[PDB]
């Protein structure tokens, strides 16, 4: 990883955009100009944001780089970084970098920015417990279990992700700046002990409940909790709903597949002021009851409209032969379970028998 003769910049740095970056850093006239290892050793910092760079191949010949600004490029592989032992600041916003394993030996890294990279798996960050700043906004992260090992972070941005479980942050008492907006957070109890916060953002939380059946009189528990576990009063409720603590209630005379409510709660933690803001969405299934009548005795089961009915075990009446399930006791037509789907209303099916 060392050149032994003067070598043109373009020969080492194969990406045309990155070659111009080295030329400009060294104040050279052309990417064809020859450079020496002593000149490469002199590079402490590279600033090449928004420069259409696809590859940093060649950077492994720069042992003394401590600061690397590469926001807004087209990078995917970062393996050439693997042995830059003195790298302290790495900014890789707006790329497509997913293989964080190349970072595992960068033990002097103090600041890491990886926003807008499509990342979901951050487990590779376990090898960087010394990090002080971490920017992971605009990604697809759900599991932040690993962050309990990052006990040196004072700055953490996780905004615009898919996080619901923030329990791994509870012990990270060094945090001073914490950006968590645009996530799925409904329970702030994990934040209660972060007494050193100065800046906190908690806006636009989208919280999705598991679906329940639609009913005429609907009750859904309020699941939004402050740092002390207390319920956050809804800011506004859809469909003319009302808040009857601890439950939100609606009268829905006609079926609808969703209700929702928005919440707002001012929050103070340590010296930090924040606005806890978000929406809880409740999907609803339209279910009705099939009643099976067997000579006056009925069993009822609930079935979603538009789905197939599972036929019950047929009744066995001595001296007769079961013929089918009919829409009326005396008369009507027979229900065909393989092709007729549950209707949008309650109804009864009647067992009919015939003589031997």
Numbering used by the authors: 36 to 391
Quote from the publication.
InlB, an invasion protein from the facultative intracellular pathogen Listeria monocytogenes, is a multi-domain protein that binds and activates the human receptor tyrosine kinase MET. The N-terminal internalin domain (amino acids 36–321; InlB321) is characterized by a central leucine-rich repeat (LRR) region that binds to the first Ig-like IPT domain of MET with high affinity. The LRR region is flanked N-terminally by a helical cap and C-terminally by an Ig-like inter-repeat (IR) region. The B repeat folds into a compact domain resembling a β-grasp fold.
Intriguingly, wild-type InlB392 was a much more problematic crystallization target than the InlB392_T332E variant. Crystals only grew in condition E6 of a MORPHEUS screen stored beyond its ‘use by’ date. At 4°C we obtained thin rod-shaped crystals with a cross-section of about 10 × 10 µm and a length of 80–100 µm. The best crystal diffracted to 3.3 Å resolution. The packing of InlB392_T332E crystal form I is closely related to that of InlB392_wt and the surroundings of all three molecules in the wild-type structure are similar. In a way, the packing of InlB392_wt can be viewed as a slightly distorted version of InlB392_T332E crystal form I with a tripled b axis.
